[PDB]
């Protein structure tokens, strides 16, 4: 039925592949046998990610064999045929079906994304964005995938505005993640250093910059305090104890912000807001070591 | 071509749709799963008819060499072999009482019947389940365990029964000169025809046409249908009686063997015999056609297989030995001969490459490289069938069975188009007669007016002087 | 001596798992698939038998219905569930067909309702809510046009003003009504048709060929400035809005009870005509008719086009309702019940699947447009089998057995006997005309599409 | 036109996209109610698109209280902002199907381009979704729904009564 | 058909959005028989 439909979709590129002199009929028949096996194992009940991944692996191996055969038997880098994009379209369609049936597999989503980015020459910015929108709709509470899409866009296209909006949406969904706050501050400082080095090369050929990260830090500490209060919200002793646990949480986090950390001024604002026992001793030893620096 | 753009566009649209359909059929031909088997001599000294079943059994795999059987049951008479249409179940009927139906691949005996009444032939009718045997007098429909389901009474001395599965129709040619089409689904004698000529010696069905071919004592074959009580066609094939006939799966070629050491290869669709093998040392007992166009002949101790004898070339006429290796002589493709057995009958297996001969001691499957077609179709006939799938296909076929009168000479003939109280009662009869005479009178007047209109369509001195005096 | 035989990979043909579904190899060789015409003919025959066995046209009725017979029906062209029905008692109702219930029930007039329309007005004082309310426009017998709100629970984005937004007093008895769409401008046909604006209590313009009355109106769907009107000097008059004037008059033989434009051609319309007929007219060439629909035995009361634009449903003064195709000119199907009488209004639905039919026993029964297409969503296998059987029956439609079992529909005995009496009368008239043709020389061979037009005004050539 | 539909759940919100509509004239019919009841016929109508779970039980309690009072929550606003397509704010609004006429106007106020629907048809779709539950989640992780029901019910009731350790 | 990348309503919805936006705003036989038949 549906398997017959898919193999009939597979026919014409095999026709062109045997018509051009690079694959004999017995090889065609063996390829079609393995194709029928994989299509039935997919379409039946109880199919699995192992079946989809094995199908993808076999199709990639067939494409590599076709490439070696075209480079050897006639020594042309690219034939003017139908198959050369047909096999890649088949792999894309396999990935589409896999992510339509098992939309929980992070590993399969990552394999899809790395495949599309690796052949990203012929792919589309819009296609990667459609994949990322689908994945972010499905798993909105994965700071790993939020950071992954933002970091891809920042290191490939450096689209500061869109990466900023990506981080804003991710932080609207997950305020509870200091890893996400950490990476947003990292991106903001990377953007600031990029801008100031752009100004430096501009002066070669011919601070609000910190204050943005300071404001991010302030709203981070506020919402982190609120949400660690909400997690395990009772009398005066329990209130004081949860207050001290939240304080230790936030101040270990600000210590991590210092480890992330111009630099002296940012640390001054951090210790300022910290002031706003043993922790106080930690603050003053940070102060005397900064004065040493 | 006509000079009307509407008809031009319509016929061109139908033509391009037809072309798209046949090209998609060729695309399925690319999607075909398997490939046939071949036998090639590879040299000039080696000939294909010099091989042996022992050599081929050594040179092939273990599955086919385990499938190629040799059963010896020497107690009862020469056995008769019939496979199911699927190709999975076998049915042997001995000459005295032995009737066995066996799955034969997984090695399971479905039904064994000992009958002292001398049986002749038997067929799986619609599945492996129900099978019909012939007896000394009556015909018997048997269930799958071996129990007796029905004693068909009217089919008296049925010599050559055979079943045809789309119409669900059980032909029973016998001895008195007679032929009875009996529907097995409704359980009813549909047609009863008398054969004027004599005792019907041979019989086979044209499967594409689903019509019956009898071979009489005169030397003529005759093609019959369950509609009309005369034969559709009659062909003088040989002299004496016709021993056997076989018909290609395509329904194109017929092979007849007649007792005056004669063999004829006929074209059924055009009724010109392709040729006539006359060099026949002993009279041919049986003749079969495989699914791949391969011809099988049995003279009784000998069985001979020809490849490509069913075409129109002069080389396609089969011979029995070439002088110096003449390529324009059709040497026999593969031979075999037994010790002292007389082969009772023979039939190819449907979806493997074997032919089973039934002979005096038992059953033998000879391996052929290219006997049966490689890849079947699973919508029609499955050698792999679960029980629910089998019974569902049975109900489906019973739903879409074809009626009996459809059996004709041209299976496209359905599509044609043509333009095709006392005194009151007495006086009522009086006035009714008057009205009918009135109707006939006005009809005659209209006819007279039309005749004069047809005449207007097609249009001596003393006589001129007397012109207007009449 | 190179040999190779036919082996089967049993793991290929039968799968190693148990839950995996086995492969189904297919070889399309016509030598392998033998009986084309016979198999397809018997498939078409079983298809028609299953269709005649599964024909179940009646699906339900709309609540308790009205008291004194449904004489006005107006579907909602925008939405899908809402229609308005109007009894001859004076009460108008706004049915939700989804739950088969009402929204409100306005006892509206003293006299009969003579027309209904549903709409949305374009007020200049404010934009009224297109979404929380619908509006109805009832055209009375006692010289009144009343415009009503309906509170509608379609959308939930709010949370007064239930009934009778506005009234338009009149001079003559209003008899028909329709609303120029996209501009909210409604024309009412009384003794002379008036074009009214919603925000003007007096009739804005007068449209009148002569001083004869008008029975009904209808605007066209596309090119929406074209109006057509049926007047009781058995005359069809096309009116135009952008020139603000009558356009062309055709005088038939008998009075046309209804008219309906078609929504997919914009210049074809069908007229339900009292001589048992439905005449399918073009607009521009009014000297003939594009088609005739013939299978009634009493006065055709109402017609409607399917929104696909290919089928016409006609309800008659006889207690029956037929469905025709545009191409054939004969009844595809007839629906009838002992409980329905004098079907005075018929409206094909808006998604082209159902047929609402308001009879005069006070019931508004809705039927199926094909007696097989069930409402449930169907899997791809069954949908392919269903379209296959339909296409095959279409191909083998004209075989005698298929034609017999496809046309054998049970008709009530009164309609059957009236039809055969009508056939006897027509055959007798035909043989008298044949005898006159035999005798007399110069008689015109009148065409059966130009026969029923007494005279058009703007004699074009 | 029922393009998307919302569904509240004790473990968060789920936003589905409708593919094929049951026809709204035969919605009272035996066959359409039976294909709502059967699971394999429901997935031709409803596929999941987004599913955002609640962070903790206290956030779940506060969001359930806001749904009970009929207002919109921060997480709800975030989910709809991510999911719904921004069309023109004057014509061709995007259709969201919900279950509460009281929840309607707040959604409309927060998003002028969206249009809420709570019909008999929308209630039928939400009823089918509630019937099939975890089978519609395609393997996406959720808590035990019934354990979530018990916990949230007790927490919401203790909040509405003001139970006390005293 | 909205996405996670572009901003939807172009107005700050959270304190993060408004603060960073205002600071970036600052930063700008047989034969015979047969013949007989």
UniProtKB/Swiss-Prot annotation, chain A:
First-listed, main subcellular location of the protein, grouped into a coarse class: nucleus
Keyword rRNA processing: yes
Gene Ontology terms: cellular component: 90S preribosome; nucleolus; nucleoplasm; Pwp2p-containing subcomplex of 90S preribosome; small-subunit processome
Keyword ATP-binding appears in the UniProt entry: no
Stretches forming HAT repeats: 86-118, 123-155, 158-190
Family named by the database record: Belongs to the UTP6 family.
Name listed for the protein in its UniProt record: U3 small nucleolar RNA-associated protein 6
The organism of origin for this protein: Saccharomyces cerevisiae (strain ATCC 204508 / S288c) (Baker's yeast)
Encoding gene, per UniProt annotation: UTP6
Full-protein interval shown: 2 to 372 of 440
Curated annotation (Swiss-Prot), chain B:
Entry's localization field: Nucleus, Nucleolus
Keywords, sorted A to Z: Nucleus, Repeat, Ribonucleoprotein, Ribosome biogenesis, rRNA processing, WD repeat
Keyword presence, Transmembrane: no
The keyword Repeat is assigned to this record: yes
Annotated Gene Ontology cellular component terms: 90S preribosome; nucleolus; nucleoplasm; preribosome, small subunit precursor; small-subunit processome
SUPFAM superfamilies per record: WD40 repeat-like
Quaternary assembly: Interacts with snoRNA U3. Interacts with MPP10. Component of the ribosomal small subunit (SSU) processome composed of at least 40 protein subunits and snoRNA U3.
Task performed by this protein: Involved in nucleolar processing of pre-18S ribosomal RNA.
Further comment found in the protein's record: Present with 5800 molecules/cell in log phase SD medium.
Record-given protein name: U3 small nucleolar RNA-associated protein 7
Annotated source species: Saccharomyces cerevisiae (strain ATCC 204508 / S288c) (Baker's yeast)
Swiss-Prot record, chain D:
Signal sequence, renumbered to the chain: none
Molecular function in Gene Ontology: mRNA binding; snoRNA binding
Keyword Phosphoprotein among UniProt keywords: yes
Localization of this protein: Nucleus, Nucleolus
A single cellular component GO annotation: box C/D methylation guide snoRNP complex
One Gene Ontology term from the biological process aspect of the record: maturation of SSU-rRNA
Keywords in alphabetical order: Nucleus, Phosphoprotein, Ribonucleoprotein, Ribosome biogenesis
Superkingdom field: Eukaryota
Record keyword Membrane present: no
Miscellaneous comment: Present with 13500 molecules/cell in log phase SD medium.
Family: Belongs to the NOP5/NOP56 family.
Task of the protein: Required for 60S ribosomal subunit synthesis.
Quaternary context: Interacts with NOP1 and NOP58. Component of the ribosomal small subunit (SSU) processome composed of at least 40 protein subunits and snoRNA U3.
Protein name: Nucleolar protein 56
Source organism phylogeny: Eukaryota, Fungi, Dikarya, Ascomycota, Saccharomycotina
Gene coding for it: NOP56
Full-sequence portion shown in this chain: 3 to 168 of 504
Swiss-Prot record, chain E:
Lineage top rank: taxon: Eukaryota
Compartments, record wording: Nucleus, Nucleolus
UniProt subunit comment: Interacts with snoRNA U3. Interacts with MPP10. Component of the ribosomal small subunit (SSU) processome composed of at least 40 protein subunits and snoRNA U3.
Function summary: Involved in nucleolar processing of pre-18S ribosomal RNA.
Family of the protein in this entry: Belongs to the UTP14 family.
Additional facts recorded: Present with 1470 molecules/cell in log phase SD medium.
Name of the featured protein: U3 small nucleolar RNA-associated protein 14
Organism: Saccharomyces cerevisiae (strain ATCC 204508 / S288c) (Baker's yeast)
